[PDB]
């Protein structure tokens, strides 16, 4: 609480200009924050999601979502609280890594690709290392610092676990990006994220291809039980692949832990051209 950590904004220190984008859980914009008085002007992107004390989270989410000192997680700059919640963060230009690998399929090299992976992983690690639960990790939910540096974002879907919590109990989060207990059992775990991360990787690997595309968001379970998983990424040696399909295991505490994904990736990284096969 108090007068420190998590700056709240008087609804006048920022103007909504053009609409950067509208998601399922809200229509984010891109305005300018004028720290009341402080002749200093700032350009950012407003996050006016739309949905009770379900704000305890939002608040507790941001509460740590700002307590960031990692180069891979869009520190929550500030917050807006009216009759409708809004968030601010140091705006990025390029955008969501999906748009990126979509404008550069025939331009990204193994290098970065294997990298992001590790970076993304580093980040998912620090949140895990701070009793957090992302819930919805995806190419879209990740911003581009530089092709050599990427960060993760939030629309406050996370939630901070309280000392005795191991799993979170429940917008909507696209079905296709979540584990099986998340669908079938409205359950959110440090491990479910891993599974989300496997999809992410898939995307990037397939250069942001639509996971499952063609097969309704209904059967994903129907087949997820039948032991069906995303196809293999053409540019992916049957060695990269395995760490992915591995996070999609049915047993949840049998999957690759975050610290780990970094290890096997901070390794592959050491020889990109060896695990991926891209012409250019």
């Amino acid at each position: 609480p108090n007068q420190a950590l998590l700056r709240i904004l008087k609804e006048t220190e920022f103007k909504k200009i053009k609409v950067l984008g509208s998601g399922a859980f809200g229509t984010v914009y891109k305005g300018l924050w004028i720290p009341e008085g402080e002749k200093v002007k700032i350009p950012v992107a407003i996050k006016e999601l739309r949905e009770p004390k379900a704000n305890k989270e939002i608040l507790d989410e941001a509460y740590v979502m700002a307590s960031v000192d990692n180069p891979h997680v869009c520190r929550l700059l500030g917050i807006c609280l009216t009759s409708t919640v809004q968030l601010i963060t140091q705006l990025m230009p390029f955008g969501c890594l999906l748009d990126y690998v979509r404008e550069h399929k025939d331009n990204i090299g193994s290098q970065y690709l294997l990298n992001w992976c590790v970076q993304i992983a580093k980040g998912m690690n620090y949140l895990e290392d701070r009793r957090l639960v992302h819930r919805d990790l995806a190419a879209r939910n990740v911003l581009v610092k530089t092709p050599q540096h990427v960060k993760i974002t939030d629309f406050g879907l996370a939630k901070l676990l309280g000392a005795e919590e191991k799993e979170y109990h429940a917008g909507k989060v696209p079905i296709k990006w979540m584990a099986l207990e998340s669908i079938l059992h409205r359950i959110y775990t440090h491990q479910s994220d891993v599974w989300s991360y496997g999809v992410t990787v898939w995307e990037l690997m397939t250069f942001g291809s639509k996971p499952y595309d063609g097969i309704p968001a209904s059967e994903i379970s129907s087949i997820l039980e039948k032991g069906e998983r995303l196809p293999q990424p053409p540019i992916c040696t049957i060695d990269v692949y395995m760490i992915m399909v591995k996070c999609w295991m049915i047993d949840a505490d049998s999957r690759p832990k975050f610290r780990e994904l970094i290890i096997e990736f901070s390794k592959m990284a050491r020889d990109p051209q060896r695990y991926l096969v891209i012409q250019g």
Binding site: D213, I223, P231, P233
Partner: peptide, 27 residues
């Protein structure tokens, strides 16, 4: 050394992993 031999880059909607029980559920 180890890539998918798809028939015209055609990457299928799904890759099956059954009967493995690490991916196939008790149901």
């Amino acid at each position: 050394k180890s890539l998918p031999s798809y028939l015209n880059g055609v990457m299928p909607p799904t890759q099956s992993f059954a009967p493995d029980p690490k991916y196939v559920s008790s149901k």
